[PDB]
């Protein structure tokens, strides 16, 4: 081989609270939307609705996070407000296998991530 292949290690672990939602470029848009929607709406009697969710998107998934957050807000009759923060995320591409013995050989790069609080506001 004149070059290493382009395998990716899983971006650490996601210390994922129940109202944390990570967005991906794999599952269908509508599903990710629908799932964020019913976390916030709860049941048909409004039971077990979240006060806020956090929508996390990395790299190319940033646009999609924004997109889901704005689509949520657009259908709330102004009951849902958004608040975006940004952050930097270290990613590790595997170059040589992690064996029993030795630390693996890895390429280090940074991606931007976005973190969108989507929260229910009510009168009074």
């Amino acid at each position: 081989p004149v070059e290493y292949t382009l395998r990716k290690r899983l971006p650490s672990r996601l210390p994922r609270r129940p109202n944390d939602i990570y967005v991906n470029m794999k599952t269908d848009f509508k599903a990710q939307l629908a799932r964020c929607q019913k976390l916030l709406d709860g049941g048909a009697r409004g039971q077990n609705a979240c006060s806020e969710i956090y929508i996390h998107g990395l790299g190319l998934a940033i646009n999609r996070a924004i997109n889901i957050a704005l689509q949520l807000q657009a259908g709330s009759f102004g009951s849902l407000q958004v608040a975006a923060n940004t952050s930097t995320v270290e990613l590790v591409d595997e170059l040589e296998p992690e064996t029993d013995t030795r630390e693996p050989l890895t390429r280090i790069r940074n991606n931007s991530a976005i973190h969108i609080r989507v929260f229910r506001v009510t009168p009074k």
Partner: protein, 116 residues
């Protein structure tokens, strides 16, 4: 290709330097201008803007400046933009970084990352 819905933070920082980030814009070019501009103490604030295919780069430019300049106050605002050849809605972003404090109640506010 033309964009459309004075500045994205006219309310918070009226005379701010506006970094209009295009897909294709070389980061190193944007960052050269941005760092020089904020090197000047009279320059109090800067804004990076982009949408669709330029969104990730918009955020990347903001994160790199925060890495060189600690203390900046940040506000991130989400908007949609319209584009024409076929007219599309694209998600987009405008990020404000301020040498001067901003009201923590501004939605999209991020306090400065301290250095321990």
């Amino acid at each position: 290709s033309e964009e459309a819905p004075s500045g994205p933070f006219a309310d918070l920082a009226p005379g701010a330097v506006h970094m209009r980030v295009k897909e294709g814009s070389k980061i190193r070019n944007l960052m050269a201008f941005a760092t020089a501009s904020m090197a000047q103490p009279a320059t109090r604030a800067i804004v990076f803007s982009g949408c669709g295919r330029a969104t990730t780069k918009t955020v990347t430019c903001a994160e790199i400046l925060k890495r060189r300049l600690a203390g900046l106050h940040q506000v991130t605002r989400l908007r949609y933009r319209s584009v024409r050849e076929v007219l599309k809605n694209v998600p987009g972003l405008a990020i404000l970084l301020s040498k001067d404090a901003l009201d923590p109640r501004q939605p999209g506010y991020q306090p400065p990352n301290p250095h321990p």
